[PDB]
């Protein structure tokens, strides 16, 4: 099947340009049966299909109303990918941006409109604020069930993304929601429950992963 | 033009129940109404296209049906992973959304306090970190107090989501203290009320042990 996959940054300064690329695997973006969009989310706004660009022996771009006189959506075709740019941005474009086909599933042989497939989405952040990665501190299991985890403190934007032994251990994991301080930075944790019994012969290690900045941080996290 | 309004915002229901979402269209003439589903923290997932076409990978429990301007989305038999928000769309317009919400037997949490680092205190800031695992449903008072006095106005709360197998909630409370005032006090507690709970439950440590 299709895979999209998104990258660009997640900070730009207010007035300034967004600029984010959907590189496409399984499907061309000159396919005569395909539609690439761009679309964003937000709490407030929820869903919003912003523009379009597809291939029918020419290109065509299509743009909703509201972005309009700031919004370009080019395909590039050594690549295989199409891309989103935003110009003069305002706090009103903080958001997540998704990239999806359209236009390839048929109902009777006519291709339908639905967003078949999705990439994983970029947080975009419109902010003056300099990035600034996070500090990980251990939340120790003390002294049949132990609570540990890691407190990662003081970053900006977000997002950031934790797992534990690199992924091997899931179960149990609980990653809480960001919340932003006083400061204006932002601070999570993430937790995970194991038997008591784990401690002394297990190895639990948070991994955390803040692609603003480039941090990836792994933290031993051990019994006091 | 075309608008999408779509009832309940949201909804509770158990485990096995039938679940009916509403879409209402106006200024359109198109049956081609799609649905998404929505868990936390992905991309939206084609759930019904064509207003009753199932998605690829879509169990048979969704079903979509369309009459006129109205277009129903119908889950036959709740599970806990269909937590979820589901959104309809037609053209370029997007519904609001419906948040679909597991109502299940009530559980207490389990609580655990957590003291600040060595290596946090020498940063000049302490966080004190009180967990409540696993519990239902979300209504939860968490109480801070150091050497006996309630504390306000220095703590943040963060919840998850509702989990996708076992249906509940769990909450952090951080307390935020500069070193000097989390040096100056010995007791550091952390009481929870829950309606799973015959009484308050308070953990607490002592600086130093």
């Known amino acids: 099947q299709v895979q999209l996959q998104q990258s660009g940054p997640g900070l730009v300064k207010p007035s300034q340009t967004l600029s984010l690329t959907c590189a496409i695997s399984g499907d061309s973006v000159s396919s005569y049966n395909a539609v690439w969009n761009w679309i964003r989310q937000s709490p407030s706004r929820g869903l919003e299909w912003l523009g379009r660009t597809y291939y029918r022996s020419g290109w065509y771009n299509d743009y909703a109303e509201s972005v309009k006189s700031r919004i370009t959506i080019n395909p590039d075709t050594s690549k295989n990918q199409f891309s989103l740019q935003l110009n003069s941005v305002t706090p009103e474009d903080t958001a997540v941006y998704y990239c999806?086909?359209?236009?390839?599933?048929?109902?009777?042989?006519?291709?339908?409109?639905?967003?078949?497939?999705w990439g994983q989405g970029t947080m975009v952040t419109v902010s003056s604020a300099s990035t600034k990665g996070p500090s990980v501190f251990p939340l120790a299991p003390s002294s049949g069930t132990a609570a540990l985890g890691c407190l990662v403190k003081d970053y900006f934007p977000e997002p950031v993304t934790v797992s534990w032994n690199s992924g091997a251990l899931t179960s149990g994991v609980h990653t809480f929601p960001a919340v932003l301080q006083s400061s204006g930075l932002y601070s999570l944790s993430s937790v995970v429950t194991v038997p008591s019994s784990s401690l002394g012969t297990q190895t639990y290690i948070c991994n955390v992963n803040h692609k603003p900045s480039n941090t990836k941080v792994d933290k031993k996290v051990e019994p006091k | 033009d075309i608008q999408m309004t779509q009832s309940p915002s949201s909804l509770s229901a158990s485990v096995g129940d039938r679940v009916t979402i509403t879409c209402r269209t106006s200024q359109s003439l198109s049956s081609y109404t799609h649905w998404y589903q929505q868990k936390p923290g992905k991309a939206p997932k084609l759930l019904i296209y064509?207003?009753?076409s199932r998605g690829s990978g879509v169990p048979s429990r969704f079903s979509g049906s369309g009459s006129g301007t109205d277009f129903t989305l119908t889950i036959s038999s709740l599970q806990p992973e269909d937590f979820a928000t589901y959104y309809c769309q037609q053209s370029r317009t997007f519904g609001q959304g419906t948040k679909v919400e597991i109502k299940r037997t009530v559980a207490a949490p389990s609580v655990f306090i957590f003291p600040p680092s060595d290596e946090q205190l020498k940063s000049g800031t302490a966080s004190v970190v009180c967990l409540l695992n696993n519990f239902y449903p979300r209504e939860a008072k968490v109480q801070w107090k150091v050497d006996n006095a309630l504390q306000s106005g220095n703590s943040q709360e963060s919840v998850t989501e509702q989990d996708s197998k076992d249906s509940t909630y769990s909450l952090s409370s951080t307390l935020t203290l500069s070193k000097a005032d989390y040096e100056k006090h010995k007791v550091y507690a952390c009481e929870v009320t829950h309606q799973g709970l015959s009484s308050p439950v308070t953990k607490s440590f002592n600086r130093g042990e």
């Open positions: 064509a207003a009753s």
């Open positions: 999806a086909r359209s236009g390839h599933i048929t109902v009777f042989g006519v291709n339908v409109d639905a967003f078949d497939m």
